[PDB]
Amino acid sequence: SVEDDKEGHLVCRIGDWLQERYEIVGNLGEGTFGKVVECLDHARGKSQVALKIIRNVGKYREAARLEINVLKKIKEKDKENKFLCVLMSDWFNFHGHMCIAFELLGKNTFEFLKENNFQPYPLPHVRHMAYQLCHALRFLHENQLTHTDLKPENILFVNSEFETLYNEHKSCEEKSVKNTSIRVADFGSATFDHEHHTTIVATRHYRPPEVILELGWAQPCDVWSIGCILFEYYRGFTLFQTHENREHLVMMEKILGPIPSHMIHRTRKQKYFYKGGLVWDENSSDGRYVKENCKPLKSYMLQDSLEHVQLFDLMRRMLEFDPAQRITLAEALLHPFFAGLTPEERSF
């Protein structure tokens, strides 16, 4: 009657119902955890929802339980729904799968980019998106909570309907999103201050130096992630296209300058250093890739203008090695970069 498979996944497709209430109408994506479907909610006037279905596996169903509690508390601490976190309307246990019902939104920021041939969002869009991220996460931080898994895939457009513009200088078409309003999603790694902090958090590309070096992590972790994301919105490609610790650190040095010595002394990962200098093989493929591809942060600017200088200044502050030294989100919202917003953008 209700069927599964190997890793757990519920056997469902467009047509199938959950709880005699949620009628599946399409697919939205899949992942390591399980699936996300578009449904109609027949107990709420055929409301359009995005239903997340965690797999029927002990530790997944388990971790989902804490995800819900995080969402309960976000919901509970923002009743006006003004702080731009994905809104959970409902959660439930279906024969082993924890399902979480969310408001239905458009494409995530990675998927939009991919479909735009990895051509960057205009700086005004980067500016408005940056501003929402800071606001959302500042709110999360304010509340003893750290996301830990921020990345473009986890940032969703409310509506991703785009305009098509011809780019004169590039001789090709570009997709320009009509509404740059966003929501922060995927709280299945979000962590309270008083809860246990796993040693390693974040997707590698967005993982900060204090985590690699194993110096402990707090809220500033999310700030490092945002720097990475803003660069990625600005250029269209990943800042740290890395698969390995050593390489990652070398990339951080090539791009941001040398690791501060107090962090080298504090870490118990001394296998990376040698007389306070990073040890790596420059003639290996990794070494050559980094040599070829990783230049100082400023060399990535596309324009000299003030608003571009300002973005790159905020970005460097977001990407400070020392987390104690790293800009906070409250300081970020005060930066002369957001003086470029429109009152509609600024007022939320």
Ligand SMILES: O=C(O)c1ccc2c(c1)nc(Nc1cccc(Cl)c1)c1ccncc12
């Ligand atoms: O986890 C959440 O908090 C979460 C919450 C809501 C959505 C979501 C993830 N992922 C979506 N799409 C998506 C895109 C790519 C891969 C995957 Cl697995 C899912 C999506 C789409 C439309 N409306 C809401 C959502």
